[PDB]
Design a protein around this ligand. Structure first.
Ligand SMILES: O=C(O)c1cccc(C(=O)O)n1
Ligand SMILES: O=C(O)c1cccc(C(=O)O)n1
Ligand SMILES: O=C(O)c1cccc(C(=O)O)n1
Ligand SMILES: O=C(O)c1cccc(C(=O)O)n1
Ligand SMILES: O=C(O)c1cccc(C(=O)O)n1
Ligand SMILES: O=C(O)c1cccc(C(=O)O)n1
Ligand SMILES: O=c1[nH]c(=O)c2nn[nH]c2[nH]1
Ligand SMILES: [Lu+3]
Ligand SMILES: [Lu+3]
Length: 295
């Protein structure tokens, strides 16, 4: 037998960094969970117990903290690129570094309508993520995403005109609840290296903000014909706003809220136009995916 692929590294590295403005007293915090996996001329660690080719995963962890100390950790696209580039430059036999970063929210508190200089709240579990693949001779590939953005609209969602055959029980509807957990990813054009990533730094935070804004506005305002149709409208807009994005991918669960027939009880009317109380379903769920690019 033979090694066809191999990668190894450190996962679940939690990192916090504080920036303290000396003039104003204002502090800013960042918290992220980092994973770094390396590839290269490492097959002999597997086949011959040759540990000489292993940069210990503990050292990978140390490098993450040292890198965070010596560089900005924001935007995450930049931090991941710096981190990945370190490994392929430092170690001759390491040829790719794969860096995943999950950014956790720490939003500044407003106390008596005034932003507090050093107190923060986790407003929701929505994440901002990056996957950075730094490959020797092939530049830097970056996928940016938002995930865990949970939304619901109580009307202005329809689902009718679908295929009906002997496997079909679903009733057509012209008014339903629509709720999802948004996972949205945008894939950047390949970057030639760290200098090119650095040259585009302002685009990263701006594009994340745009992607979030477009997602929420489209979801809120579309009179939705389906999850499919609404997600395509989102992707189309994001591509239109940032030419350095090559593709946009959505993965959306359709989290079902079922009507509850209560007419068996004192003729109570709770369906159709009288539907007020619903049973949220934990499972199963629809899962709808799409990748949209430029034609
Ligand atoms: O959408 C449908 O319900 C449909 C479509 C073709 C034939 C039939 C039928 O024979 O009932 N029903
Ligand atoms: O087999 C079919 O054509 C079918 C299946 C479900 C509903 C209906 C219908 O409402 O006509 N028709
Ligand atoms: O027009 C139709 O699609 C139709 C009409 C009567 C019965 C059914 C059915 O059993 O699905 N479908
Ligand atoms: O990444 C960018 O979008 C960028 C970088 C440098 C200057 C400018 C600019 O002046 O718009 N924009
Ligand atoms: O090359 C650029 O960075 C650029 C070009 C046109 C507009 C903008 C901008 O508004 O940021 N940025
Ligand atoms: O700050 C900037 O200059 C900026 C922000 C978002 C997009 C762009 C761009 O596409 O040029 N530029
Ligand atoms: O928006 C929807 N898309 C679908 O594909 C689907 N299937 N059942 N309900 C659905 N709702
Ligand atoms: Lu029929
Ligand atoms: Lu610009």
């Amino acid at each position: 037998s033979a090694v066809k692929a191999a990668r190894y590294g450190k996962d679940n590295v939690r990192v916090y960094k504080v920036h303290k403005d000396e003039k104003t007293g204002v502090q800013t915090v960042y918290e992220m969970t980092v994973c770094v996996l390396l590839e290269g001329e490492i097959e002999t660690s597997y086949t011959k117990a040759d540990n000489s080719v292993i940069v210990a995963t503990d050292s990978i962890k140390n490098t993450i903290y040292i890198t965070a100390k010596q560089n900005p950790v924001t935007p995450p696209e930049l931090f991941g690129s710096i981190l990945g580039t370190h490994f392929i430059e430092k170690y001759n036999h390491i040829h790719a570094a794969h860096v995943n970063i999950v950014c956790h929210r720490w939003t500044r508190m407003d106390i008596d309508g005034k932003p507090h200089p050093h107190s923060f709240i986790r407003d929701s579990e929505e994440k901002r993520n990056v996957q950075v693949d730094v490959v020797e001779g092939k530049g830097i590939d970056i996928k940016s995403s938002l995930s865990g953005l949970t939304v619901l609209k109580s009307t202005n969602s329809q689902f009718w005109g679908f295929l009906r055959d002997e496997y079909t029980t679903l009733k057509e509807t012209w008014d339903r609840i629509l709720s999802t957990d948004v996972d949205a990813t945008w894939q950047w054009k390949n970057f030639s290296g760290l200098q090119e990533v650095r040259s585009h730094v302002p685009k990263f935070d701006a594009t994340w903000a745009t992607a979030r804004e477009v997602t929420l506005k489209t979801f809120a305002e579309d009179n939705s014909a389906s999850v499919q149709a609404t997600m395509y409208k989102m992707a189309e807009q994001i591509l239109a706003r940032q030419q350095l994005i090559e593709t946009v991918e959505y993965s959306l669960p359709n989290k079902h809220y079922f009507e509850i027939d209560l007419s068996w009880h004192k003729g109570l009317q709770n369906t159709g136009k009288n539907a007020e109380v619903f049973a949220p379903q934990s499972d199963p769920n629809g899962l709808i995916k799409c990748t949209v690019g430029r034609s």
